[model samples]
Target chain A: VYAQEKQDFVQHFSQIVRVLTEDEMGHPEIGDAIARLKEVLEYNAIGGKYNRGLTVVVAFRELVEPRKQDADSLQRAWTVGWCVELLQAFFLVADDIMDSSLTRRGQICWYQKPGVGLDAINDANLLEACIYRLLKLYCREQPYYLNLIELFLQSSYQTEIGQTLDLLTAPQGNVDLVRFTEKRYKSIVKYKTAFASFYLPIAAAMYMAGIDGEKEHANAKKILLEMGEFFQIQDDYLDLFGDPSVTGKIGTDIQDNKCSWLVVQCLQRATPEQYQILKENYGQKEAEKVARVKALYEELDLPAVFLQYEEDSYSHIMALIEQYAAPLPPAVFLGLARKIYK
Target chain B: VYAQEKQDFVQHFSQIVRVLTEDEMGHPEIGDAIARLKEVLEYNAIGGKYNRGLTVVVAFRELVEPRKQDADSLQRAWTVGWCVELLQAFFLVADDIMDSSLTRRGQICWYQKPGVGLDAINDANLLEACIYRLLKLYCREQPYYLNLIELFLQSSYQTEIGQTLDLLTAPQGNVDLVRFTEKRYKSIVKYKTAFASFYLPIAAAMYMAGIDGEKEHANAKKILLEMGEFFQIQDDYLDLFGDPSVTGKIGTDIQDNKCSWLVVQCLQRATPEQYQILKENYGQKEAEKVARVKALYEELDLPAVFLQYEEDSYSHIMALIEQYAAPLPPAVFLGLARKIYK
Candidate 1:
């Protein structure tokens, strides 16, 4: 049932793109800009796994009653989902430029493309601008208009703060392991990866469903944020251990000097000699050096450590859901958990 | 009276800075980030002539009756004024990066400063982010919260679209004179420079003073946007002809290959020989070639042309103000005209 909903949601994504970049009646002056905007939307907004956006649609379906789920409501939910996707695109395009990333999702990063250098900065801002545009187009007259705008703005601010933390912690061409505290890693994940990726979509759907109570949204945030942390930890774990075919990308965290969860764990457990190994071998692009760091992670038994963490995190989050997921259906939270865990 | 109000508004600027970057109650984890943000605020947000920000305060004072212009009301006006400044700061920081500009407000560009490089992208975003932050903090309980948010968002979108047009027309390292049409110049300036710089500050003050009618706003936008165009044309004229010491920065539109109003005018009026001179000498960095282009402007009697155009524009704007500055006080429009016209 959820599969069909997600497929439909994904299919409806193009219409959201069309409404944003196409001149329906007036605004013919923006035709050239719309053409460029369409390229930006296609390049960055699409090709994501759609898990974050799909979560919005899936959660909205479960939260609102079947009898109330009219065509208009579903369309609203799907447009909100695309808003989430656009937010992600905004972050990734700018993040890639800051991180000096060569590629994203198996293609060249937008900033790195010829004739599209620093202008991608403005392009990313335009991508972010589309979220509010979409919200205004679909949900402006709805009571939740201000709520949705504030929610998206707050999410963007939190994510930017988190991105700042991540950049400062793991500056390019700089190797500073001392800054990579476990607390800092948690802070980075919670702010940078978790809020928009996990909490925003679900919270947005909750707002659309008329669930605007502060306590309820806070509770949802608690559960969703925990889920987000777990999701990111899994991502860190998969970077080193998961198959390239399964993950669809090779890991660069080690060579890129990212303050990964695995590295923080290894740093906590490493002996003085092991610390020396990390200091020397980390953040180098050469294969042998990267291999040495991976070997050190193996010797530290980080995979086993991750497995243990996965079990504990799952149990803790389940407890959070049980304690907090009342008044709103558990199915909404459970649906998201199932996708991330799978 | 206006000079005293301007002094007060300028003095109140630091309080907005403190409110935004300083942690009064908590958030120690972001202490380092706060420090960086403080630096960004100081570096980019300060040191400007602050005509845009001061416009908000001045208009607010003029629109609101003296009885109601108490401490809280005045503080809100100043804060909103700073919000406009923040918006300008946001644009300039990013604009410098895109234009490869060396200086702003007689100081090194934020991005060009050591240790600042591409990280200025996020810094610029933080600057943009702070406008909303200030709005929420100062005006959340006010009825105009949604109005203010939407206004800022729409202005930002307009400016970004304008930036795109400007970038597309005069891409760095590419000289395409055909793109510098009068229509394109007007489109670029109206969207990029006019809306945010002129209309936003005054419209914000109007909204704050309880002028919420769409017709009133449309009228205000009509008058302010005309002023914006006249303001930009004067700016273009000043770029080549104005004394650098008086203007406070050297002009680079010719070297940067900008689609300035003067260039559009020149193209329209240039004889075949003058056109050949422009095509050959424009966009070249050599001092002699730049001199040759300026000499062509003189030979074509562009100075006399600009003087006539300026007088015509000033009168046209006065006519617009007489027509549209009703419903709202004429003083508000007159005050702004005084600043720009002088």
Candidate 2:
């Protein structure tokens, strides 16, 4: 129900782009620049599975008043969902440059694309500006415009703060697991990914649905962030444990010196002998060294430990929804958990 | 009166940083991240001439009712002015990275400093986030909050569009003077620098002072943008012709292949023989080649041409101030003009 509706959500993108072209960009002087904006929106934003965007759409359907869910209401919901996607696209474009990533979604990353390089920095900023432009175009007259803008701004700040934490933990060189504590890991995950990728979608839907109270958002944030953390932990587990045939890409977190959840847990449980093995083998790129790290995880029963943590996270998130998903349908969260826990 | 008030404004910055520290960043887990945020504020923002920011302060005082100019009101104006400064710091930090500039305000560019490279992209984003954080911290309850936010957003878009024009015209290597026309140069100057540097400060004050009418802004925008355009033309002129001892920097637009004003004018007036001279010697590294390009400009009487344009711009700006400065005092525009024309 969530991911299948991507086309319906995507069909409205042209109308959104047209707003810039026909309304804001009809002038001859900026025609070339406006065309670059058109390319930026199409190239970077259109490639994703749009689950984050689709999550906003699905939650809006579940949360908004059915009577108020007219064509115009659905249009605004869809447009705002694209804003979430645009925010992600902006981050991904800039993120690729920061990480020196070469590709995204099977295409050259916007930053790595020819004629782009570092100018993609400004290009990424244009992607961010598109969010507010879409907002003002579609939802400016909507009563909750300010609420939505503030939510997006706060989400960006939270995510950037998380990025700071992650970067400080693992810089561009040799892996030092000194600061990779569980407490630090949790802060990085919650602020960097959990808030924007998880909390923002539903919270955006909630605001558009006029659920702007502190308690209501707090309730939604708790469930979504827990789901996001669980989901990220699963990603970390899958990097080392999941099959490349299934996951599509081989995991590089171990090689990249990432501050992964599995590593944090390993640090907690490793004996001095195991710690020495990790210190020598972790963050190494050679196949033999990476295999040794994996073997050490197996010898330590990390697979079983991960399975237990996964089950525990799933159970806790379900309980959170049960306790706090009140005055609102549980299906919105259940839908998210169903997508992740499955 | 405007620039001399720098100390009064600088004093309030600690309170602003504390709001983030005590209010938003009080968490034990993210203490290190908050501290980095502190360094970003101080390192990039404090060194620039606060002229752009002080314009906001001065205009707020000049435009607001005298009774309304209480200490708290003054504080808000001052804080918003800092927001303007934050916006510039954000741009400079990012712009330095994009241009690969080595130093700014006599210090190593943030990205070029030790242990900071492409990671500066996120730091720049954090600097941008600080603008809104400060706005929310200081002026959330204020009535014109949405207006200020929207103005900043639009200014950013306009500037980014301008950056696109500038980059497309003059890429990393090889001076392609084919696209560097006077028309394109005007567009690049207006969008890239004029709106944010010249118009945003006063326009922010206008919104805060309840002077947000389209006619009023359009009127103020007309004068300010002309002043901004004139100001940028002088900067370009200074880069090539002004003494290095006086300007504190050597000119690099010719060597850098920048889309500058003097080059555009030289292109417009150069004969076929002179055009050939530019094509052969432009965008070169050798001192002799650069000197040859400068000599060709002199042969075309560019220095005399520049003097004529400078006089015309000052005259035209004075006329704009006289014609449009009504319902508001002329001193506001005059003060800006006096500072520049001097």
Candidate 3:
């Protein structure tokens, strides 16, 4: 059912682009500039799996009264979902530039394309500006308008803070292992990835459903943040262990000196001699050095450790959902859990 | 009297920095990241003349009844003023990176600083995020909270579109003189520079003062945007003719192939032979070629043409203020006019 909904959601994606770009197209002053804006929307805003955006629609469907979920409501939900995707696109475009990334979603990263260069910075910002434009277009009349605005703004701020923590924790050309503590790792994930990825879409749906209680939103945040933690940890695990075909890209966290969960866990468990090996092998671009770090992970039984972690993290999240997912349907949380756990 | 107010406004700036960064200082998760945040705030948000921000304060003082303007109200006005500055800081940091600028406010551009590079993209975003943060902190309870949020969001979108038009009009490493049309020039200036720089601060103050009528806002926007056009046109004129000591930096619009007003105007008046001279000499970095273009501007009496244009532009703006500066105090527009006219 969710798969079909996602397919429908993806099909509806072009209308969102048309509405946004058409607003610009209305102005003859933009002229050919409209074509460039259209390209920006098509390239950056699409191509994702639609998971983050789909969550908004799915969660809204689960949360809202069926009678109230009319055609307009459904359209609003889908548009807002794409707003989340736009937010992610905004971050990814700038993030690719900052990370000096080569490819995203199997294509040249927007910043890496010939002539795109630093101009992608403004393009990233334009992507973000679209979120507000869509919100104002669709949700401005809804009672929950301010609620949605604040949520997205807070999510952006938290994600930026998380990015800051992540960047400072692993400054480029610096070999500072001490900064990669598990506490710092969690902070980065929670702020950088969790808030927007896990909490924003659901929280958005909650507001739309008239779930405006502070305690209820806070409860949802707790469960979703925990899920975000698990989601990112899985990402870290998959970076090294998951096949390129499965994960869709080769791992670079190890080579990029990223403060990854695997690295933090490895640091916690390594003996002094093993630590010395990791210090040298980690964060190096050489295939041999990257292999050496992977070898050390194997030596430390990290896959087994990850298996244990996956089990514990899943249960912990399930318990939190059970404890917190009340007054709202249990399926709202469960639906998200099923997607991430799989 | 206005000079003293500007001095006081600059003095209050450090407090805005403290309130924003101190909130993070309370979070143990940020740790030494506090120091990094402080550096980013100081480096990017400070140093410029605080005209835009001070406009917010001064306009607020004029718009709001003095009897109602108490300490808290005054403080909120100043805070919102700085928010405008924060918006500018956000734009400039990313802009410097995009323009590959060497200096800002007599210091190396934030992105050009050692260890800053593309990370300034996120830093610029953080600066923008602070505007909303300061708004929520200082103006959340005000009736104008939602209005302020929408205004800032709209301003950002306008500026980004303006920026897109600008980048397309004068793309680096590609010379397309045909793109430098007068119509395109006005669109770029109005969207990119005028809306945020000229209208936002005064419009924000108008909102705070409870002047929320559509007609009034439309009126204010008309006058302010006209001022913005004159402001940018003057900037273009000064780039070639103004002294480096007075402007505080050497101009590069010629070599950089800017879609500047001067070039567009020059194109309008250039004979075929003069156009050939421009086609050969424009957009080249060699000093002699640059001199040849300047010599052509002289031979065509462009400087005298500029003097007459400046006189006409100032009077036209004054006439606009006379027509539109009703319903709101005339001094509000006149005060701004006096500053820009000089």
What are the lDDT figures for the candidates, one per model? 0.85, 0.84, 0.87
B243-328: candidate 1 lDDT, tens digit per residue? 76677656888887888887888888888888989988888778898899899888878989988988898899999988999988
Instruction: Report the Cα lDDT for residue A198, model 2.
Output: 93
TM-score of chain A for the candidates in order shown: 0.94, 0.91, 0.96
Q: What docking class should model 3 receive?
A: medium
How close to the true structure is residue A309 of candidate 3, measured as C-alpha lDDT? 91
DockQ winner, 1 or 2 = 2
**Candidate 3 runs further than 4 Å off:** A285-288, B243-245, B284-295
Residue A127 lDDT (model 1)? 95
Best by lDDT: 3
Q: On residues B160-232, what C-alpha lDDT tens digit does candidate 3 reach at each position? A: 9898888887766676678889888989999999999999999999999999999999999989998999898
lDDT score of residue B241 within candidate 1? 92
Per-residue lDDT of A204 in model 2:
94
Rank order (by lDDT, best first): 3, 1, 2
lDDT of 2 by residue, A229-260 (tens): 88778878987898765654457777767789
> What order do candidates take by DockQ, descending?
2, 3, 1
- Judged by whole-model lDDT over C-alpha atoms, candidate 1 comes out at 0.85
Which whole-number lDDT from 0 to 100 does residue A134 have in model 1?
A: 90
lDDT of 2: 0.84
Best by DockQ: 2
* Every model's TM-score: 0.94, 0.94, 0.96
